[PDB]
Amino acid sequence: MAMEDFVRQCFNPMIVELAEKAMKEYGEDPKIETNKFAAICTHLEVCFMYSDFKHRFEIIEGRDRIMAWTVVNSICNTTGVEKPKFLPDLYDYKENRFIEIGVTRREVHIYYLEKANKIKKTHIHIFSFTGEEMATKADYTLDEESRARIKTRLFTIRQEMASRSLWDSFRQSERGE
Ligand SMILES: O=C1c2c(O)c(=O)ccn2N([C@@H]2c3ccccc3SCc3c2ccc(F)c3F)[C@@H]2COCCN12
Ligand SMILES: [Mn+2]
Ligand SMILES: [Mn+2]
């Protein structure tokens, strides 16, 4: 069972199509980087579930680069929040801060450090496939139920992969050698 076939079966087609466009834009082939194809789908789903819990969250992820920065610029212009160097994933209109969503197959503490290091005001929220999470100042933003649902979906994706013998590959491809 190919990872590419898993992605197209396990994820909603709107998620798959946006993941494909994002990979084309950054010059990556979903037929070759199939684990990355799956990771982008998973992360994209988490961002939509995050902004699902008028609307508290603007979704930056899932847009072509130009539109993504247009939304970021428009928000900064109307709130005076400092424009970030790196594209974030969400904007929280209640806390008035951008959010960076991370999903990792490794230890959350390790991935949190990697993310915090790369961006040096953007709130960070890391999820794992084991039910763990780590967030800036231990401020998890959402209520308990909302995070429990994200954790359950991630764990379900993991078990759906494991049943098709895809988990081990997916786990090891996150960080290079
Ligand atoms: O939006 C993201 C992004 C994140 O937000 C993230 O948390 C991790 C990684 N990201 N990257 C995603 C991405 C997203 C989710 C899971 C893995 C990857 S792996 C690199 C890659 C991404 C998108 C397309 C592509 F072809 C890639 F090679 C790029 C980093 O440059 C800003 C846009 N972006
Ligand atoms: Mn992003
Ligand atoms: Mn992210």
Author numbering: -1 to 51, 73 to 139, 142 to 198
Article excerpt on this structure:
To verify the reduced endonuclease activity of the I38T mutant, we purified the isolated endonuclease domain from influenza A and B virus polymerase with either Ile or Thr at position 38. For influenza A, we used residues 1–198 from strain A/California/04/2009 (pH1N1) with truncation of the flexible loop (Δ52–64:Gly), as previously described. All four PA-BXA co-crystal structures exhibit clear and unambiguous electron density for the compound, which is bound in essentially the identical fashion in each structure. BXA has a butterfly like form, with one wing comprising a metal chelating polar oxazino-pyridotriazin-dione head-group and the other wing, a lipophilic, difluoro-dihydro-dibenzothiepine tail-group that makes van der Waals contacts with certain residues of the active site pocket. As expected, the head-group binds to the two divalent cations in the endonuclease active center, each metal ion having octahedral co-ordination through interactions with the protein, to the compound or water molecules, as previously described. In FluA wild-type, BXA makes van der Waals contacts with Ala20 and Tyr24 from the C-terminal end of helix α2 and Lys34, Ala37 and Ile38 from helix α3. Tyr24 binds across the two wings of the compound, contacting both the oxazino on the head group and the difluorobenzene on the tail-group. These interactions together with a salt-bridge between Glu26 and Lys34 stabilises the α2-α3 loop that is otherwise particularly mobile. Conserved Ile38 intimately packs into the V of the tail-group in identical fashion in both FluA and FluB, making van der Waals contacts via its CG1 and CD1 atoms. In the absence of BXA, the Tm of all four endonuclease constructs is 46–50 °C. BXA binding to the endonuclease increases very significantly its thermal stability, with the Tm for the wild-type FluA or FluB endonuclease shifting to 78 or 77 °C, respectively, corresponding to ΔTm of +32 and +29 °C, respectively. In the FluA crystal structures E198 makes a salt bridge with Arg124 from a neighbouring molecule so no clear conclusions can be made about the possible role of E199 residue in BXA binding in the context of the complete polymerase.
It is responsible for replication and transcription of the segmented, single-stranded viral RNA genome (vRNA) in the nucleus of infected cells. We initially screened metal-chelating compounds by CEN enzymatic assays, followed by a cellular phenotypic screen and then optimized the chemical structure to improve the pharmacokinetics and safety. This culminated in the generation of the compounds BXA and BXM that target the CEN in the PA proteins of influenza A and B viruses.
